[PDB]
Amino acid sequence: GVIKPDMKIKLKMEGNVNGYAFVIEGEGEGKPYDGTNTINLEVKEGAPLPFSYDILTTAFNRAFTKYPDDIPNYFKQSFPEGYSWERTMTFEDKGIVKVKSDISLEEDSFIYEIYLKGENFPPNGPVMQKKTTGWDASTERMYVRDGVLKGDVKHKLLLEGGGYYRVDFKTIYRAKKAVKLPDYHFVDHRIEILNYDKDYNKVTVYESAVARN
Numbered sequence: 776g777v778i779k780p781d782m783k784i785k786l787k788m789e790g791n792v793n794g795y796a797f798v799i800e801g802e803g804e805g806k807p808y809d810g811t812n813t814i815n816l817e818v819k820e821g822a823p824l825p826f827s828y829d830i831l832t833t834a835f836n837r838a839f840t841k842y843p844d845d846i847p848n849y850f851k852q853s854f855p856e857g858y859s860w861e862r863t864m865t866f867e868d869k870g871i872v873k874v875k876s877d878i879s880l881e882e883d884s885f886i887y888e889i890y891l892k893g894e895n896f897p898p899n900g901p902v903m904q905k906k907t908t909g910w911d912a913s914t915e916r917m918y919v920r921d922g923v924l925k926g927d928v929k930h931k932l933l934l935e936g937g938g939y940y941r942v943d944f945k946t947i948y949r950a951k952k953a954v955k956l957p958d959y960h961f962v963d964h965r966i967e968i969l970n971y972d973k974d975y976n977k978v979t980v981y982e983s984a985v986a987r988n
């Protein structure tokens with residue numbers, strides 16, 4: 776078909792967090808049916824980033840999700856035409872991240888065009904102070920509204936020193952063609968920074984995702 780068992784990844788993110796502009800480019804690979812993917816990121820403008828890299832990582836494609844055969848796959852059906860998504864992340868100290876991403880396909884490589892805005896982060900908060908230590912494993916509730924798929928995550932970031940920092944995710948996924956719509960289901964996530972140079976100019980992100988009834 777169009778979605779191979781091995782697919783490459785290319786992306787560009789143009790970002791602005793509390794007024795600080797930056798550009799990140801990435802390349803990687805994954806196994807869509809296994810629900811795993813790795814992306815190697817480079818900061819192109821804005822290095823070194825003056826905020827927590829964790830607020831970017833979940834922006835760096837649910838095509839990479841293991842789906843049981845009996846739950847229709849909203850994301851894989853959308854190709855070759857593809858899909859786009861938009862996300863609002865609300866942090867417990869009133870910081871906000873807004874993301875738009877367009878996911879397209881060429882040959883055996885996905886292409887992401889990402890725009891990300893962060894705002895209202897307290898100067899002394901864990902994001903601006905770079906005091907976060909990654910995301911917990913999460914469960915995203917997927918449900919259909921207005922002919923598109925929506926996703927909810929009551930998430931938390933882990934903090935340096937053992938604390939935690941709650942974040943609500945709301946995502947809207949929009950296929951660029953008609954597909955068989957699934958009903959209420961869950962996607963379990965695990966996302967991790969595998970390695971980084973000092974100040975995170977070069978970072979590798981790994982994610983696994985599995986859907987379930």
Ligand SMILES: [Cl-]
Nearest residue numbers: 780781805806
């Ligand atoms: Cl492989």
Ligand SMILES: [Cl-]
Nearest residue numbers: 861862863945
């Ligand atoms: Cl949204």
Ligand SMILES: [Cl-]
Nearest residue numbers: 783882883884
């Ligand atoms: Cl190839």
Ligand SMILES: [Cl-]
Nearest residue numbers: 911930931939
């Ligand atoms: Cl918890």
Ligand SMILES: [Cl-]
Nearest residue numbers: 845960987988
């Ligand atoms: Cl069941």
Ligand SMILES: [Pd+2]
Nearest residue numbers: 780781805806
């Ligand atoms: Pd393979």
Ligand SMILES: [Pd+2]
Nearest residue numbers: 783784785884
């Ligand atoms: Pd290429």
Ligand SMILES: [Pd+2]
Nearest residue numbers: 800801817819
């Ligand atoms: Pd480069």
Ligand SMILES: [Pd+2]
Nearest residue numbers: 787789888889
């Ligand atoms: Pd662009």
Ligand SMILES: [Pd+2]
Nearest residue numbers: 871873892894
């Ligand atoms: Pd805004």
Ligand SMILES: [Pd+2]
Nearest residue numbers: 793825898903
């Ligand atoms: Pd700042």
Ligand SMILES: [Pd+2]
Nearest residue numbers: 904905906935
């Ligand atoms: Pd420290």
Ligand SMILES: [Pd+2]
Nearest residue numbers: 920925945947
């Ligand atoms: Pd809604």
